[PDB]
């Protein structure tokens, strides 16, 4: 992975040694080049994973997440450079440095072979993320959002640290390849119940599981755009990726320990989907949409079937691009009217025709129109949960109806109807904004032509 | 906010339109329109206003019982089949300020005349504000009515968004 | 219950301005100043060539040399055979049915 770690590190001297007026041009260009080289991780085999060294390996799960991570960095620089224009040069470079350091931690997190190494990098991503929200967030409540984000994570991740160290004492290793062969079944006992909870709760809080999700709508409403993009696109998936790995060593206890969390997710997705119908803040609505989509991923991971694991992987990639798009679309309205209230600016299709097309395409992927990878992932999960229990189709089906209602409600309210009379500063869409939208949707829709590369190891 | 006279005349217009919806045929509607007008005429000169109010209240109860469940609606009236149909084509005039210079270059005459209107609006605004100040009682306006211009060369206060509103068929 | 004299005056003044504004929406003669059966068959001839002949060449080439070179990609329902038919592949003759009872 050094071929990706080192050029990612080199982005920092590049940004600090650039001409004052070329920091965005240089950092954007070269992080796109890094993104290009990340397609070499597609050398995946039918049986064995791509095992680079003692520290890092890649397989069909981490590879799509790695490519999404490295693609998002140039998109985040594009999205941020406008609202940061007044910021002084040194603080602009510090912002870019936090984004670069976040990518470095993420690519190491997704390829770490040893689980304790994964833990440290999994935890390291908090620091830059918290700095981005609290330092460059706009409103007073970013400080509270920083605290809720920090302490929800640590409340769960500290027990995970104890469990992981305990496993290494008992098994002798935390290398994931070793655990694949030395895994022993988890017997029933109260000690093992709490070992299971310690191994899972940290990832649940990040997903987030319904009931532990209240930190996420806060974080989004306060974060700058780049913070929201990385939060929705990648940082939520640290939980899913972690769960997909650690469930290896929790069998067969997961058979019954998953029940409370399947109930929370199955009922949670309908609650959060219903909540979206009444949200008044556009960022908050998109945030609640994420909780509903990720509730599907939790269920898929917990029932552990080949179809559910393939659907979970596709959903994680598909949601990453869609939710990042939706935040970017909402932000482009914010940069004009400086309010997140959904009902403030209406009938924008009359004033911004092409931006309304991006709004339509994003909404259609959010409601999972076939054959988008959003639908492929959701469908594979629905198929597998039907076998788990036929009654789940009723809950899955109801959520599909509610998802369409709130996705189109968001499109109708902001883009259709009559424009607001007094809002007279809706200037035409910039080339930057249009390019940013298309750099989300185009790879998303292109993936429909070759979905296998985002279906994960079980493919 | 409605006087007794306004309430009676609104019911007369409303009752005739529902009658026309029941009758359909013009000769039939003419016949019953005269019968209905006679009913309003018998109590035209009622003086005991308590009786007049009771007549109005009973008439409204009669209208509610006998209203058409699907009355005719003019196509562009609220609830009609063409209501708000052309709102998607109505674009506010401030949008022309964001046109690229090459777009403006296609209509040199239109935009020269547009600048004259913007100049007229700019030079009129201070006097419009002052007129409203000196004509408004201390505690602010008590009604939504606005006054005319008083001198020559003045424009009626707050005229721009009325005069420059989108055309009803803008495309 | 008609206009007050002040209402009448305001409407008259706005009416003068509105009509002037609407007149100013008319395009001048030069606007927009813009920057720099034999036919019927030919129109339909070029369309048939580019929208039927070229696509069918591509589809036929694709079906003949890529799709039908793989098993079971195009599967036909086997032709119906009736009593008295002759087979091209073998030359086999299918015998007729029995003699029908009169009806």
């Amino acid at each position: 992975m050094l071929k990706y770690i080192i050029p990612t590190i080199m982005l920092m001297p590049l940004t600090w040694l650039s001409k004052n007026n070329m920091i965005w041009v240089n950092s954007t260009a070269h992080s796109l080049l890094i993104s290009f080289t990340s397609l070499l991780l597609m050398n995946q085999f039918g049986d064995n994973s791509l095992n680079f060294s003692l520290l890092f390996f890649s397989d069909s799960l981490s590879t799509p997440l790695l490519i999404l991570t490295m693609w998002l960095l140039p998109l985040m620089l594009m999205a941020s450079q406008h609202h940061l224009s007044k910021e002084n040069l040194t603080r602009k470079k510090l912002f870019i440095t936090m984004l670069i350091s976040l990518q470095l931690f993420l690519i190491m997190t997704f390829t770490a072979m040893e689980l304790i190494l994964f833990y440290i990098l999994f935890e390291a991503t908090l620091v830059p993320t918290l700095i981005i929200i609290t330092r460059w967030g706009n409103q007073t409540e970013r400080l509270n959002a920083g605290l809720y984000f920090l302490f929800y994570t640590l409340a769960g991740s500290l027990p995970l640290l104890v469990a992981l160290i305990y496993i290494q004492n008992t098994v002798g290793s935390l290398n994931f390849l070793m655990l694949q062969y030395w895994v022993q079944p988890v017997h029933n006992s109260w000690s093992n119940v709490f070992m299971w909870l310690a191994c899972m709760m940290a990832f649940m809080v990040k997903m987030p599981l319904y009931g532990l999700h209240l930190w996420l709508p806060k974080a989004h409403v306060e974060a700058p755009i780049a913070g929201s993009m990385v939060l929705a696109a990648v940082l939520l998936k640290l939980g899913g990726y972690g769960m997909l790995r650690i469930t290896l060593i929790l069998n067969p206890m997961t058979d019954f320990m998953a029940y409370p969390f399947i109930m929370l997710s199955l009922w949670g997705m309908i609650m959060t989907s219903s909540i979206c119908l009444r949200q008044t803040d556009l960022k908050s609505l998109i945030a609640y949409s994420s909780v509903s989509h990720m509730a599907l991923v939790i269920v898929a991971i917990l029932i552990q079937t080949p179809w559910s694991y393939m659907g979970a992987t596709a959903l994680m990639i598909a949601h990453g691009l869609t939710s990042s798009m939706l935040f970017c679309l909402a932000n482009s309205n914010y940069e004009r009217i400086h309010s997140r209230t959904m009902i403030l600016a209406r009938g924008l299709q009359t004033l911004l025709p092409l931006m309304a097309t991006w709004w339509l395409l994003a909404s259609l992927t959010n409601l999972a129109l076939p054959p988008t990878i959003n639908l492929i992932g959701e469908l594979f999960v629905v198929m597998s949960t039907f076998s788990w229990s036929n009654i789940t189709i009723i809950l899955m089906g109801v959520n599909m109806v509610i998802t369409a209602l709130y996705s189109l409600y968001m499109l109708i309210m902001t883009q259709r109807g009559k424009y607001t009379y007094h809002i007279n500063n809706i200037s035409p869409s910039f080339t930057r904004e249009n390019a940013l939208m298309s750099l989300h949707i185009l790879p998303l829709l292109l993936l429909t032509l070759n979905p296998k590369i985002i279906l994960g190891p079980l493919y | 906010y409605l006087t007794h006279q306004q309430k009676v005349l609104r019911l007369y217009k409303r009752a005739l339109r529902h009658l026309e919806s029941w009758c359909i045929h013009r000769d039939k509607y003419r016949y019953f329109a005269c019968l209905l007008r006679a009913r309003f005429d018998e109590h035209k000169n009622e003086k005991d206003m308590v009786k007049a109010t009771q007549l109005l209240r009973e008439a409204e109860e009669e209208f509610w019982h006998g209203q058409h469940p699907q009355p005719y609606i003019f196509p562009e009236s609220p609830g009609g089949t063409s209501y708000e149909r052309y709102e998607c084509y109505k674009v506010p005039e401030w949008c022309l300020d964001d046109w690229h210079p090459s777009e403006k270059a296609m209509y040199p005459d239109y935009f020269a005349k547009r600048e004259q209107w913007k100049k007229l609006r700019r030079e009129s605004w201070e006097r419009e504000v002052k007129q409203l100040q000196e004509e408004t009682p201390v505690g602010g306006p008590r009604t939504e009515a606005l006054p005319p211009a008083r001198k020559q060369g003045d424009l009626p206060p707050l005229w721009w968004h009325i005069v420059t509103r989108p055309r009803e068929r803008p495309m | 219950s008609g206009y007050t004299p002040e209402e009448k005056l305001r409407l008259q003044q706005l009416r003068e301005l509105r009509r002037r504004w609407l007149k100013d929406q008319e395009l001048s003669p030069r606007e927009p100043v813009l920057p720099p059966v034999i036919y019927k068959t030919y129109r339909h001839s070029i369309f048939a060539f580019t929208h039927v002949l070229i696509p069918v060449w591509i589809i036929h080439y694709y079906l003949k040399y890529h799709v039908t070179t793989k098993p079971y990609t195009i599967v036909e329902k086997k032709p119906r055979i009736f009593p008295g038919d002759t087979i091209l592949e073998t030359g086999e003759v299918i015998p007729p049915m029995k003699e029908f009872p009169d009806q």
């Binding site: 025709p353 | 090459s102 777009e103 | -």
Partner: peptide, 12 residues
Amino acid sequence: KRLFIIKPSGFY
């Protein structure tokens, strides 16, 4: 006659 059609800028 022909009347000017007010549209948002289509150039960008």
